[PDB]
Amino acid sequence: HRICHCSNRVFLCQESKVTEIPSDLPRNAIELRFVLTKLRVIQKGAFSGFGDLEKIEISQNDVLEVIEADVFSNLPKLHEIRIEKANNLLYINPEAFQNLPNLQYLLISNTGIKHLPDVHKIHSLQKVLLDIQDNINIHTIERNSFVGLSFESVILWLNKNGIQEIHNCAFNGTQLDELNLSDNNNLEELPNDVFHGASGPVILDISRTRIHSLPSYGLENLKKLRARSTYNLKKLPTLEKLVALMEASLTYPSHCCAFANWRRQISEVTCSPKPDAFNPCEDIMGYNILRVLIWFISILAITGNIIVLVILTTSQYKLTVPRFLMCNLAFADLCIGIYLLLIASVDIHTKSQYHNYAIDWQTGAGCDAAGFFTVFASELSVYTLTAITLERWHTITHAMQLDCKVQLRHAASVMVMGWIFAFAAALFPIFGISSYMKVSICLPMDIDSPLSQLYVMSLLVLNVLAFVVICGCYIHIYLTVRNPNIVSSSSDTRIAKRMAMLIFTDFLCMAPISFFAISASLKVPLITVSKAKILLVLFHPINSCANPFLYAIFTKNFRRDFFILLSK
């Protein structure tokens, strides 16, 4: 052919020279392919007479705008139809497709058509697989849209569509085998009578959709259900309706745990993701000993922080920069203890029934608040420890200047900046950067998205760098203090001892947790979720609880101040 290459009865028309369908193409051609054609409008009945045609492929039809009626008319052997890259194709003739008994595959992608093509006249005898995707212009599905597509079972691949609403009885009169509606961001709800008059679907794929709830009827024949990333699907229909449901791919491990409990009751379905120790359905704490110790630890931490703050504020002596740092550390410890007490209360309230309230707790504002509070407390404590270590190092190594030219105003400004940074970090999970609902302890373990993983890695790196800097400063201060060439003061020795104790406690509390978090972030979890929860419950608040006794209570001045206050 002059305009299209011919080989084994296959015509491959390409280039811009193809402004219209050539009428000279042999009627016996088996496959016709149009790539990067300049055709704007497809003439009606263009493919008429192509009895031997088996497959039709249209791609890169940027200039294509309209398809005339009866184009795909009276094709006995036409089994596969492919349309792609037809961005300008906004209008499709309703009667374009008709009389296709042997139709088996119909792929339409990258099309600007705002309405689904009318395939009622297809009347395909064999199974027809519909593959409609990248149809942003399509927003609604009319009733009986797929009616008359084919007599046998048909698979409707409608993923990557802009469908926002679905009318009742949309699939009525259709033998839906598998449905692929995933990637429908605008899909918010599905009518109950959507499947009325239809068969199946056997397999449903609603992953990455905003469907609030599934239809209460028509799912009896659903064998497989896919709802990955379907956050809006907080609650699913009763297991009784899904009798045929054999496999499930949801996005809420709590729902899978509830189904497992129902399976045990039935005994007295492969559902993923399976429950795990990160989000237990029995109890958040799990171990009775850990739950009992948690309340005591939280109470002790809160009492110690309150006592330290009261003593520091009521002290008659002048409030030094170290006093402000100790007050900030006590406030951070009190916040951590409050978060721990809230977690313990939540665990105790739902004892033996966490599974029922697991969804509410994880999705509730309480979990987000607890996670934000824990993150803010940890950031504030780290910043305060780093600032105290830096001030001590400047005072010791720069004995010429009291604190390397440091005053109360500078310390207050540094504390304010650290508090602002901690608040910003704690607000990140609330702003969609990762999520605290991924764990029952409200920890921001969500790293599925690149942004959340990057934020977690950055936080871990910052914590590690701060710890390393603090350790180096402490080592330098200790070396300087013991140097015989420098006459270290007794107050300097006491400050060094207190700083060493605080640094040792912080390192003991943080190093294991930091290492575990780093390992987990790299997709190499070296510890189970149950062990990690216990470690975070015990080690993390242990440092905060020991901070008062290590820093202030052990100090002679603090003891004297407490004794004076007690005399009042």
Coordinates of C-alpha atoms in Angstrom, one line a residue:
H1 CA 0.0 0.0 0.0
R2 CA 1.2 3.5 -0.9
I3 CA 0.0 5.0 2.4
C4 CA 0.4 2.1 4.8
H5 CA 2.9 -0.7 5.0
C6 CA 1.4 -4.2 4.3
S7 CA 2.7 -7.5 5.6
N8 CA 0.9 -10.8 6.1
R9 CA -2.5 -9.0 5.5
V10 CA -1.6 -6.5 8.3
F11 CA -1.8 -2.8 7.5
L12 CA 0.2 -0.4 9.6
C13 CA -0.7 3.2 8.6
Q14 CA 1.5 5.8 10.3
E15 CA 2.9 9.3 9.8
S16 CA 0.9 12.5 9.3
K17 CA 0.2 11.4 5.7
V18 CA -2.9 9.5 7.0
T19 CA -5.4 12.3 7.2
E20 CA -8.3 9.9 6.5
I21 CA -9.0 6.1 6.5
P22 CA -7.8 4.9 3.0
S23 CA -10.6 3.3 1.0
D24 CA -8.0 1.2 -1.0
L25 CA -7.2 -1.0 2.0
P26 CA -7.9 -4.7 1.2
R27 CA -11.1 -6.0 2.6
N28 CA -9.3 -9.2 3.6
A29 CA -6.9 -7.4 6.0
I30 CA -6.7 -9.2 9.3
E31 CA -5.2 -6.5 11.5
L32 CA -5.2 -2.7 10.9
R33 CA -3.0 -0.4 13.0
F34 CA -3.1 3.4 13.0
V35 CA -0.2 5.1 14.9
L36 CA 0.4 8.8 15.0
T37 CA -2.2 9.4 12.4
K38 CA -3.4 12.9 11.5
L39 CA -7.1 11.9 11.1
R40 CA -9.4 14.2 12.9
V41 CA -12.8 12.6 12.4
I42 CA -13.5 8.9 11.7
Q43 CA -16.0 8.6 8.8
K44 CA -19.2 6.5 9.5
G45 CA -18.9 2.9 8.3
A46 CA -15.1 3.3 7.8
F47 CA -14.5 -0.4 8.8
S48 CA -17.6 -1.7 7.0
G49 CA -16.9 -4.6 4.7
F50 CA -13.8 -5.8 6.8
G51 CA -15.2 -9.3 7.4
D52 CA -11.7 -10.8 7.8
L53 CA -10.6 -8.1 10.2
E54 CA -9.6 -9.5 13.5
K55 CA -7.9 -6.7 15.5
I56 CA -8.1 -2.9 15.2
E57 CA -5.4 -0.7 16.9
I58 CA -5.5 3.1 17.1
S59 CA -2.8 4.9 18.9
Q60 CA -1.3 8.4 19.1
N61 CA -4.4 9.8 17.5
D62 CA -3.8 13.3 18.9
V63 CA -5.8 15.0 16.2
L64 CA -8.7 12.6 16.4
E65 CA -11.8 14.5 17.7
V66 CA -15.0 12.7 16.7
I67 CA -15.9 9.1 15.8
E68 CA -18.9 8.6 13.5
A69 CA -21.6 6.0 14.0
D70 CA -21.5 2.5 12.7
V71 CA -17.7 2.6 12.4
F72 CA -17.3 -0.7 14.2
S73 CA -20.4 -2.2 12.5
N74 CA -20.9 -5.8 11.3
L75 CA -17.5 -7.1 12.2
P76 CA -17.8 -10.9 12.6
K77 CA -14.1 -11.6 13.2
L78 CA -13.3 -8.4 15.2
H79 CA -12.1 -9.8 18.5
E80 CA -9.8 -7.0 19.8
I81 CA -10.3 -3.2 19.6
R82 CA -7.6 -0.9 21.0
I83 CA -7.9 2.9 21.2
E84 CA -5.2 4.9 23.0
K85 CA -3.6 8.4 23.1
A86 CA -6.8 9.9 21.7
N87 CA -6.6 12.9 23.9
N88 CA -8.7 15.1 21.5
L89 CA -11.4 12.4 21.2
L90 CA -14.3 14.1 23.0
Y91 CA -17.3 12.9 21.1
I92 CA -18.1 9.2 20.3
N93 CA -21.1 8.2 18.3
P94 CA -23.5 6.1 20.3
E95 CA -24.0 3.7 17.3
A96 CA -20.3 3.4 16.6
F97 CA -20.1 -0.1 18.0
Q98 CA -22.6 -2.8 16.9
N99 CA -22.8 -6.3 15.6
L100 CA -19.6 -7.7 17.1
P101 CA -20.4 -11.3 18.1
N102 CA -16.7 -12.3 18.4
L103 CA -15.7 -9.2 20.3
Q104 CA -13.4 -10.2 23.2
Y105 CA -11.3 -7.2 24.1
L106 CA -12.2 -3.5 23.9
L107 CA -9.5 -1.1 25.2
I108 CA -10.1 2.7 25.3
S109 CA -7.5 4.8 27.1
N110 CA -6.3 8.4 27.1
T111 CA -9.6 9.7 25.7
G112 CA -11.3 13.0 26.3
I113 CA -14.8 11.5 25.9
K114 CA -17.0 12.7 28.8
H115 CA -19.5 9.8 28.5
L116 CA -19.0 6.1 28.3
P117 CA -19.5 4.7 24.8
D118 CA -22.9 2.9 24.3
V119 CA -22.0 -0.7 23.8
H120 CA -25.6 -2.0 24.0
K121 CA -25.5 -3.0 20.3
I122 CA -22.3 -5.0 20.7
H123 CA -24.2 -8.3 21.5
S124 CA -20.9 -10.1 21.8
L125 CA -21.4 -13.9 22.2
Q126 CA -18.1 -14.7 23.8
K127 CA -16.7 -13.1 27.0
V128 CA -15.8 -9.4 26.4
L129 CA -13.2 -7.7 28.6
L130 CA -13.7 -4.0 28.8
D131 CA -10.6 -1.9 29.6
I132 CA -11.5 1.8 30.1
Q133 CA -8.8 3.8 31.9
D134 CA -7.4 7.3 31.9
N135 CA -10.9 8.6 31.2
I136 CA -10.7 11.8 33.3
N137 CA -13.6 13.3 31.3
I138 CA -15.9 10.5 32.5
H139 CA -17.6 11.5 35.8
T140 CA -20.9 9.6 36.0
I141 CA -22.2 6.1 35.1
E142 CA -25.7 5.9 33.7
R143 CA -28.2 3.1 34.5
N144 CA -27.8 0.0 32.3
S145 CA -24.7 1.4 30.8
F146 CA -23.2 -2.0 30.3
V147 CA -26.5 -3.7 29.4
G148 CA -26.3 -5.5 26.1
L149 CA -22.5 -5.5 25.9
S150 CA -22.3 -9.3 25.7
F151 CA -24.3 -12.4 26.5
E152 CA -21.6 -14.2 28.5
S153 CA -19.5 -13.0 31.4
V154 CA -17.7 -9.7 30.9
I155 CA -14.8 -8.1 32.9
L156 CA -15.2 -4.3 33.3
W157 CA -11.8 -2.6 33.9
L158 CA -12.8 0.9 34.8
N159 CA -9.8 1.9 36.9
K160 CA -8.0 5.2 36.4
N161 CA -11.3 6.9 35.7
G162 CA -12.7 10.2 36.9
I163 CA -16.1 8.7 37.8
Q164 CA -17.4 10.5 40.9
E165 CA -21.0 9.1 41.2
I166 CA -22.7 5.9 40.1
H167 CA -26.4 5.6 39.2
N168 CA -28.6 2.8 40.5
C169 CA -28.8 -0.4 38.4
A170 CA -25.6 0.8 36.5
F171 CA -24.7 -2.8 35.7
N172 CA -28.2 -4.2 35.4
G173 CA -28.5 -6.9 32.8
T174 CA -24.8 -7.6 32.8
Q175 CA -22.9 -10.7 33.9
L176 CA -20.0 -8.9 35.7
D177 CA -17.2 -11.3 36.3
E178 CA -14.5 -8.9 37.7
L179 CA -14.7 -5.1 38.3
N180 CA -11.7 -2.9 38.4
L181 CA -12.8 0.5 39.7
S182 CA -9.6 1.4 41.5
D183 CA -7.8 4.7 41.2
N184 CA -11.2 6.5 41.4
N185 CA -10.3 9.4 43.7
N186 CA -13.7 11.1 43.2
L187 CA -15.6 7.9 44.0
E188 CA -17.2 8.8 47.3
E189 CA -20.2 6.5 47.6
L190 CA -21.9 3.6 45.8
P191 CA -25.7 3.3 45.7
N192 CA -27.2 0.2 47.3
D193 CA -29.1 -0.7 44.1
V194 CA -25.9 -0.3 42.0
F195 CA -25.7 -4.1 41.4
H196 CA -29.5 -4.6 41.2
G197 CA -30.4 -6.7 38.2
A198 CA -26.8 -7.7 37.7
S199 CA -24.7 -10.8 38.2
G200 CA -21.8 -10.6 40.5
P201 CA -19.3 -9.0 40.4
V202 CA -17.1 -12.0 41.4
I203 CA -14.0 -9.9 41.9
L204 CA -14.1 -6.2 43.1
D205 CA -11.2 -3.8 43.0
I206 CA -12.0 -0.5 44.7
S207 CA -8.4 0.3 45.9
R208 CA -7.5 3.9 46.0
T209 CA -11.0 5.2 46.3
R210 CA -13.1 7.4 48.7
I211 CA -16.0 5.0 49.0
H212 CA -17.4 5.5 52.4
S213 CA -19.3 2.2 52.5
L214 CA -20.1 -0.7 50.2
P215 CA -23.6 -1.6 49.0
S216 CA -25.7 -3.6 51.5
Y217 CA -26.8 -6.0 48.7
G218 CA -25.5 -7.5 45.5
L219 CA -22.2 -8.6 47.1
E220 CA -23.3 -12.2 47.8
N221 CA -21.4 -13.4 44.7
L222 CA -18.3 -11.3 45.5
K223 CA -15.4 -13.9 45.8
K224 CA -12.5 -11.4 46.0
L225 CA -12.5 -7.9 47.3
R226 CA -9.7 -5.3 46.9
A227 CA -9.8 -2.1 48.8
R228 CA -6.1 -1.1 49.2
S229 CA -5.7 2.5 50.2
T230 CA -9.4 2.8 50.8
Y231 CA -9.3 4.9 54.0
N232 CA -12.8 6.1 53.6
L233 CA -14.1 2.5 54.0
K234 CA -14.0 2.6 57.8
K235 CA -16.8 0.1 58.2
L236 CA -17.7 -2.9 55.9
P237 CA -21.0 -4.8 55.6
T238 CA -21.7 -7.7 57.8
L239 CA -19.8 -10.9 57.1
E240 CA -23.1 -12.7 56.5
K241 CA -23.7 -10.7 53.3
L242 CA -20.2 -11.7 52.0
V243 CA -20.8 -15.4 52.1
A244 CA -18.9 -16.1 48.9
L245 CA -16.0 -13.7 50.0
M246 CA -13.0 -16.0 50.0
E247 CA -10.1 -13.5 49.7
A248 CA -9.9 -9.9 50.8
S249 CA -7.3 -7.1 50.4
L250 CA -8.4 -4.2 52.8
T251 CA -6.4 -1.4 54.3
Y252 CA -7.4 -1.8 58.0
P253 CA -5.7 -4.6 59.9
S254 CA -8.4 -4.1 62.6
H255 CA -11.1 -5.2 60.3
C256 CA -9.1 -8.4 59.4
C257 CA -8.8 -9.1 63.2
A258 CA -12.5 -8.8 63.7
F259 CA -13.1 -11.2 60.7
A260 CA -10.6 -13.7 62.3
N261 CA -12.6 -13.5 65.5
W262 CA -15.8 -14.2 63.5
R263 CA -14.0 -17.2 61.9
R264 CA -13.3 -18.6 65.4
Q265 CA -16.9 -18.2 66.3
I266 CA -17.9 -19.9 63.1
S267 CA -15.6 -22.9 63.9
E268 CA -17.0 -23.0 67.4
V269 CA -10.9 -16.3 54.3
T270 CA -7.5 -15.0 53.2
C271 CA -7.9 -11.4 54.4
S272 CA -4.9 -9.0 54.3
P273 CA -3.2 -7.2 55.8
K274 CA -3.2 -9.6 58.8
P275 CA -3.3 -8.3 62.4
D276 CA 0.0 -7.7 64.0
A277 CA 1.5 -6.7 67.4
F278 CA 1.8 -3.1 66.1
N279 CA -2.1 -2.7 66.2
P280 CA -3.2 -5.5 68.5
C281 CA -7.0 -6.2 68.7
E282 CA -6.9 -7.6 72.3
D283 CA -5.1 -4.9 74.2
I284 CA -2.8 -2.0 73.3
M285 CA -0.3 -2.9 76.0
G286 CA -0.7 -6.7 75.7
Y287 CA 1.3 -7.7 78.8
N288 CA -0.5 -7.3 82.1
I289 CA 2.7 -6.4 83.9
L290 CA 3.5 -3.7 81.3
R291 CA 0.0 -2.2 81.6
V292 CA 0.3 -2.2 85.4
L293 CA 3.7 -0.6 85.4
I294 CA 2.7 2.0 82.8
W295 CA 0.3 3.8 85.2
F296 CA 2.8 3.9 88.0
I297 CA 5.5 5.2 85.7
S298 CA 3.2 7.9 84.3
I299 CA 2.1 8.9 87.8
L300 CA 5.7 9.1 89.0
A301 CA 6.9 11.1 86.0
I302 CA 4.0 13.6 86.4
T303 CA 4.6 14.0 90.1
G304 CA 8.3 14.5 89.6
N305 CA 7.9 17.0 86.8
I306 CA 5.3 19.0 88.8
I307 CA 7.5 19.0 92.0
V308 CA 10.6 20.0 90.0
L309 CA 8.7 22.9 88.3
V310 CA 7.2 24.1 91.6
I311 CA 10.6 24.0 93.3
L312 CA 12.3 25.9 90.5
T313 CA 9.6 28.5 90.2
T314 CA 9.2 29.1 94.0
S315 CA 13.0 29.1 94.7
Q316 CA 14.1 32.4 96.3
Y317 CA 17.5 32.2 94.6
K318 CA 18.0 33.8 91.2
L319 CA 16.8 31.7 88.2
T320 CA 20.0 30.8 86.2
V321 CA 20.1 29.6 82.6
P322 CA 20.6 26.0 83.9
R323 CA 17.5 26.5 86.0
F324 CA 15.5 27.4 82.9
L325 CA 16.9 24.4 81.0
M326 CA 15.9 22.2 83.9
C327 CA 12.5 23.7 83.9
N328 CA 12.1 23.1 80.2
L329 CA 13.3 19.5 80.6
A330 CA 10.8 19.0 83.5
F331 CA 8.0 20.4 81.3
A332 CA 8.9 18.0 78.5
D333 CA 9.0 15.1 81.0
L334 CA 5.6 16.1 82.3
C335 CA 4.2 16.2 78.8
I336 CA 5.6 12.7 78.1
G337 CA 4.1 11.4 81.4
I338 CA 0.7 12.9 80.5
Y339 CA 0.9 11.1 77.1
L340 CA 1.8 7.9 78.8
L341 CA -1.0 8.2 81.3
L342 CA -3.5 8.9 78.5
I343 CA -2.2 5.8 76.7
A344 CA -2.6 3.7 79.8
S345 CA -6.1 4.9 80.4
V346 CA -7.0 4.1 76.8
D347 CA -5.6 0.6 77.2
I348 CA -7.4 0.0 80.5
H349 CA -10.7 1.3 79.2
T350 CA -10.7 -1.2 76.2
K351 CA -9.3 -4.1 78.1
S352 CA -10.2 -7.4 76.4
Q353 CA -12.2 -5.3 73.9
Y354 CA -9.6 -3.2 72.1
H355 CA -10.6 -4.8 68.7
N356 CA -14.1 -3.2 68.9
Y357 CA -12.7 0.2 69.7
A358 CA -9.4 -0.2 67.7
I359 CA -10.8 1.5 64.7
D360 CA -12.2 4.4 66.7
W361 CA -9.0 4.9 68.7
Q362 CA -6.7 4.7 65.7
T363 CA -8.9 6.9 63.5
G364 CA -10.0 9.1 66.4
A365 CA -8.5 12.4 67.3
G366 CA -7.2 10.8 70.5
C367 CA -4.5 8.8 68.8
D368 CA -3.3 11.8 66.7
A369 CA -3.2 14.0 69.9
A370 CA -1.2 11.4 71.8
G371 CA 1.3 11.0 68.9
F372 CA 1.7 14.8 68.6
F373 CA 2.2 15.2 72.3
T374 CA 4.8 12.4 72.4
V375 CA 6.7 13.8 69.4
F376 CA 6.6 17.3 70.9
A377 CA 7.8 16.1 74.3
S378 CA 10.7 14.1 72.7
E379 CA 11.8 17.0 70.5
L380 CA 11.6 19.4 73.4
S381 CA 13.7 17.1 75.7
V382 CA 16.3 16.5 73.0
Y383 CA 16.6 20.3 72.3
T384 CA 16.8 21.1 76.0
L385 CA 19.5 18.5 76.5
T386 CA 21.5 19.7 73.5
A387 CA 21.3 23.3 74.6
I388 CA 22.3 22.5 78.2
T389 CA 25.3 20.4 76.9
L390 CA 26.4 23.2 74.5
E391 CA 26.1 25.8 77.3
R392 CA 28.1 23.6 79.7
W393 CA 30.8 23.0 77.0
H394 CA 31.1 26.7 76.3
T395 CA 31.3 27.6 80.0
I396 CA 34.0 25.0 80.6
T397 CA 36.2 25.2 77.5
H398 CA 35.8 29.0 77.4
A399 CA 36.4 29.7 81.1
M400 CA 37.4 33.2 80.0
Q401 CA 33.7 33.9 79.1
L402 CA 31.1 32.8 81.6
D403 CA 29.0 30.9 79.0
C404 CA 30.9 31.9 75.8
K405 CA 29.0 35.2 75.8
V406 CA 25.7 33.7 76.8
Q407 CA 23.0 35.5 78.8
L408 CA 19.5 34.8 80.1
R409 CA 17.9 36.4 77.1
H410 CA 19.9 34.3 74.7
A411 CA 18.9 31.1 76.6
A412 CA 15.2 32.1 76.5
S413 CA 15.4 32.8 72.8
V414 CA 17.1 29.4 72.2
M415 CA 14.4 27.7 74.3
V416 CA 11.6 29.5 72.4
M417 CA 13.1 28.4 69.0
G418 CA 13.5 24.8 70.2
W419 CA 9.9 24.8 71.4
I420 CA 8.7 26.2 68.1
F421 CA 10.7 23.6 66.2
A422 CA 9.3 20.8 68.4
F423 CA 5.7 22.1 67.8
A424 CA 6.3 22.2 64.1
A425 CA 7.7 18.6 64.1
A426 CA 4.7 17.4 66.2
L427 CA 2.3 19.1 63.8
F428 CA 3.8 17.3 60.7
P429 CA 1.8 14.1 61.2
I430 CA -1.4 16.1 61.5
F431 CA -0.6 17.8 58.2
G432 CA -0.6 14.4 56.3
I433 CA 3.2 13.9 56.6
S434 CA 3.0 10.3 57.7
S435 CA 0.2 9.2 60.1
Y436 CA 0.0 8.1 63.8
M437 CA -2.9 5.7 63.2
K438 CA -0.4 3.2 61.8
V439 CA 0.3 2.0 65.3
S440 CA -1.8 1.5 68.4
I441 CA 0.7 3.6 70.4
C442 CA 0.0 6.5 68.0
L443 CA 3.6 6.5 66.9
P444 CA 4.3 8.0 63.4
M445 CA 5.5 4.7 62.0
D446 CA 3.8 5.3 58.7
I447 CA 6.5 5.3 56.1
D448 CA 4.7 3.9 53.0
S449 CA 4.8 7.3 51.2
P450 CA 8.3 8.7 50.3
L451 CA 7.5 11.9 52.2
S452 CA 6.7 10.1 55.5
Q453 CA 9.8 7.9 55.3
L454 CA 12.0 10.9 54.5
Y455 CA 10.6 12.8 57.4
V456 CA 11.2 9.9 59.8
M457 CA 14.7 9.4 58.5
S458 CA 15.4 13.1 58.9
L459 CA 14.1 13.1 62.5
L460 CA 16.2 10.0 63.3
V461 CA 19.3 11.6 61.8
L462 CA 18.8 14.8 63.7
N463 CA 18.3 12.9 67.0
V464 CA 21.5 10.8 66.3
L465 CA 23.5 14.0 65.5
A466 CA 22.3 15.7 68.6
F467 CA 23.2 12.7 70.7
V468 CA 26.6 12.5 69.2
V469 CA 27.2 16.2 69.7
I470 CA 26.1 15.9 73.3
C471 CA 28.4 12.9 73.9
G472 CA 31.4 14.7 72.4
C473 CA 30.7 17.9 74.4
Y474 CA 30.4 15.8 77.6
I475 CA 33.6 13.9 76.9
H476 CA 35.5 17.2 76.2
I477 CA 34.1 18.7 79.4
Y478 CA 35.1 15.7 81.5
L479 CA 38.6 15.7 79.9
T480 CA 39.0 19.4 80.7
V481 CA 37.8 19.1 84.3
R482 CA 40.3 16.3 85.1
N483 CA 43.2 18.2 83.5
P484 CA 45.6 19.3 86.2
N485 CA 46.7 22.4 84.3
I486 CA 43.2 23.9 84.9
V487 CA 41.9 24.7 88.3
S488 CA 38.3 23.4 88.0
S489 CA 35.8 24.9 90.5
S490 CA 33.7 22.7 92.8
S491 CA 30.5 24.0 91.2
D492 CA 32.0 23.1 87.8
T493 CA 32.6 19.6 89.1
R494 CA 29.0 19.3 90.4
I495 CA 27.6 20.6 87.1
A496 CA 29.8 18.1 85.2
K497 CA 28.6 15.2 87.3
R498 CA 24.9 16.2 86.9
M499 CA 25.4 16.6 83.1
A500 CA 27.1 13.2 82.9
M501 CA 24.3 11.5 84.8
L502 CA 21.6 13.1 82.6
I503 CA 23.5 12.2 79.4
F504 CA 24.0 8.6 80.5
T505 CA 20.3 8.3 81.3
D506 CA 19.3 9.9 78.0
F507 CA 21.6 7.6 76.0
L508 CA 20.5 4.5 77.8
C509 CA 16.8 5.4 77.1
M510 CA 17.3 6.5 73.5
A511 CA 20.1 4.4 71.8
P512 CA 18.1 1.1 71.7
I513 CA 14.9 2.9 70.5
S514 CA 16.8 5.0 68.0
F515 CA 18.6 1.9 66.6
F516 CA 15.3 0.0 66.3
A517 CA 13.7 2.9 64.5
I518 CA 16.6 3.2 62.1
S519 CA 16.5 -0.5 61.3
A520 CA 12.7 -0.4 60.8
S521 CA 12.9 2.6 58.5
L522 CA 15.3 0.8 56.2
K523 CA 12.8 -2.1 55.7
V524 CA 14.9 -4.3 58.0
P525 CA 12.9 -4.7 61.3
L526 CA 15.2 -6.5 63.7
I527 CA 12.5 -6.6 66.5
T528 CA 8.9 -7.5 66.7
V529 CA 6.1 -4.9 67.2
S530 CA 5.3 -6.4 70.6
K531 CA 8.9 -6.0 71.8
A532 CA 9.1 -2.5 70.4
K533 CA 6.0 -1.4 72.2
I534 CA 7.3 -2.7 75.5
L535 CA 10.7 -1.0 74.9
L536 CA 9.0 2.4 74.1
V537 CA 6.7 2.1 77.1
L538 CA 9.6 1.3 79.5
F539 CA 12.8 2.8 78.3
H540 CA 11.4 6.0 76.8
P541 CA 9.6 7.3 80.0
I542 CA 12.3 5.9 82.2
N543 CA 14.7 8.7 81.3
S544 CA 12.0 11.3 81.9
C545 CA 11.2 9.8 85.3
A546 CA 14.9 9.6 86.3
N547 CA 15.6 13.2 85.1
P548 CA 14.2 14.9 88.2
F549 CA 16.1 12.7 90.7
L550 CA 19.3 12.7 88.6
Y551 CA 19.3 16.5 88.1
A552 CA 17.5 18.4 90.8
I553 CA 16.7 16.1 93.7
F554 CA 20.3 14.9 93.9
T555 CA 21.4 18.5 94.1
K556 CA 22.1 19.9 97.5
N557 CA 20.6 23.3 96.6
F558 CA 17.4 21.7 95.3
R559 CA 17.1 19.6 98.5
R560 CA 17.6 22.8 100.6
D561 CA 14.9 24.6 98.6
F562 CA 12.5 21.7 99.0
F563 CA 13.1 21.6 102.7
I564 CA 12.5 25.4 103.0
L565 CA 9.3 25.1 100.9
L566 CA 8.1 22.1 103.1
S567 CA 8.6 24.3 106.2
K568 CA 6.0 26.7 104.9

